[PDB]
Amino acid sequence: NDVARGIVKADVAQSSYGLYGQGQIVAVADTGLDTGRNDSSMHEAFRGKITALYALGRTNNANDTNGHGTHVAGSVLGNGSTNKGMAPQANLVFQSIMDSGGGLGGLPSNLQTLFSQAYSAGARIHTNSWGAAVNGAYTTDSRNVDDYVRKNDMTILFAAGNEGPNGGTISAPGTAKNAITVGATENLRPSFGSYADNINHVAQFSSRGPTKDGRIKPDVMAPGTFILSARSSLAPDSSFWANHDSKYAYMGGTSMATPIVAGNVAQLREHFVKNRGITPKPSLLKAALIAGAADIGLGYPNGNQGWGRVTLDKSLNVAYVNESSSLSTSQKATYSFTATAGKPLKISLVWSDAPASTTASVTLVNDLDLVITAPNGTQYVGNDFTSPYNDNWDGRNNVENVFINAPQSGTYTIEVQAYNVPVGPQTFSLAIVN
Numbered sequence: 001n002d003v004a005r006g007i008v009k010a011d012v013a014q015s016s017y018g019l020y021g022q023g024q025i026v027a028v029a030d031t032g033l034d035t036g037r038n039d040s041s042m043h044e045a046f047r048g049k050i051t052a053l054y055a056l057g058r059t060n061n062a063n064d065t066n067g068h069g070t071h072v073a074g075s076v077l078g079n080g081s082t083n084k085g086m087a088p089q090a091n092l093v094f095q096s097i098m099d100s101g102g103g104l105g106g107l108p109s110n111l112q113t114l115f116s117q118a119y120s121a122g123a124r125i126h127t128n129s130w131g132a133a134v135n136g137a138y139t140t141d142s143r144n145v146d147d148y149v150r151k152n153d154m155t156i157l158f159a160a161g162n163e164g165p166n167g168g169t170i171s172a173p174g175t176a177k178n179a180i181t182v183g184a185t186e187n188l189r190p191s192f193g194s195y196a197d198n199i200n201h202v203a204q205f206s207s208r209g210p211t212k213d214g215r216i217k218p219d220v221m222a223p224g225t226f227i228l229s230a231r232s233s234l235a236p237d238s239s240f241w242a243n244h245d246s247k248y249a250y251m252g253g254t255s256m257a258t259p260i261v262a263g264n265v266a267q268l269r270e271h272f273v274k275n276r277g278i279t280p281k282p283s284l285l286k287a288a289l290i291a292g293a294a295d296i297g298l299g300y301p302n303g304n305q306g307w308g309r310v311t312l313d314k315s316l317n318v319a320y321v322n323e324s325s326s327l328s329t330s331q332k333a334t335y336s337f338t339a340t341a342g343k344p345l346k347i348s349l350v351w352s353d354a355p356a357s358t359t360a361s362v363t364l365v366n367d368l369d370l371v372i373t374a375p376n377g378t379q380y381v382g383n384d385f386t387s388p389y390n391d392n393w394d395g396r397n398n399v400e401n402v403f404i405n406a407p408q409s410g411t412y413t414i415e416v417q418a419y420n421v422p423v424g425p426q427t428f429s430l431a432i433v434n
């Protein structure tokens with residue numbers, strides 16, 4: 001966590017912007033949380049900061065004999081004396097879904113039940129280091145994630161899965177359109193060897209897109225190898241990659257990358273609410289993370305890194321549109337942005353789409369297109385990264401991007417065009433970095 005904090009710029013968010021996640025509540029659905037008791041027995045990283053601790057998988061037992069859940073929650077918001085999570089003043093809703101057999105039987109059949117329970121408790125961010133390895137398929141769980149986000153103010157994150165490095169290995173519900181799906185790059189702890197020596201390396205195991213219908217997943221990356229975070233007092237050494245001390249130990253997986261991003265979302269949401277005067281919609285938090293992300297060196301579009309590695313300080317300050325307009329087929333919204341040529345210009349359009357059928361061959365329901373015009377007339381179409389940049393149109397993704405490394409100083413025109421919106425009108429968010 002301490003090195004991940006610096007890689008994703010949560011250190012700048014904390015030290016220069018004051019963002020530790022205070023006032024935000026993150027829900028984690030995972031194995032269990034240390035002793036399973038919201039009292040003074042609880043691990044120092046969560047003692048006193050638990051909004052609610054629910055036992056779903058084992059009636060009346062939310063403890064963590066595995067370790068996964070405690071480490072995950074630790075990375076979101078742990079506030080112990082060392083190895084703090086990214087949002088260490090956020091409060092925690094924890095849903096313990098591990099069943100007596102070690103499986104995830106506490107999950108309800110309809111995942112909307114899980115998310116609504118968390119929402120009722122006050123959580124507005126819900127993070128899930130779990131999934132089924134269904135090679136990019138959009139399942140009932142994916143559908144319910146999508147329906148839930150379109151109807152409720154909840155940012156939902158899912159791990160991409162650990163079936164890399166082959167293409168097309170994204171887990172469900174990480175295949176949901178409206179979640180933020182997170183893959184793992186390496187942490188920088190090179191004494192532990194090749195899994196933690198290059199922050200621009202995709203971890204070998206991280207699942208890779210595209211999804212079954214060709215969409216780019218994961219959406220973003222974060223460090224997910226040799227992450228030092230909270231150690232359940234009931235977990236054995238075999239659950240960890242390496243020991244550290246009685247309260248903290250190492251783990252790696254997309255399960256570790258996801259909660260780093262979830263804590264960054266708490267920091268970002270705090271910033272919008274306290275410092276920018278608005279409650280940012282899930283689509284805007286997602287767009288802002290995407291526009292701020294760093295190309296780890298593979299270029300775009302790319303299923304190995306998605307849109308790149310979270311870089312939180314760039315996301316804090318984006319120019320935005322927060323679902324303030326909705327579009328039906330053939331309509332367009334227009335914005336103008338004055339750019340400066342010193343720095344890259346990155347524009348990200350994200351929408352919380354209508355849920356797809358589990359039987360559809362193409363999951364995108366409502367298709368918006370991003371079209372940008374430079375001061376000197378050059379046009380760019382969302383996700384067209386091959387010159388000429390206005391000839392390849394996107395009909396699959398509900399994230400569209402125009403990234404220009406050396407922009408012209410001057411006013412750029414930004415159009416969001418409703419190509420085909422059968423379940424309309426469709427709103428959207430934009431985030432702009434320059």
Ligand SMILES: [Ca+2]
Nearest residue numbers: 194195197201
């Ligand atoms: Ca490496």
Ligand SMILES: [Ca+2]
Nearest residue numbers: 368369394395
């Ligand atoms: Ca499109």
Ligand SMILES: [Ca+2]
Nearest residue numbers: 386388389392
């Ligand atoms: Ca092209």
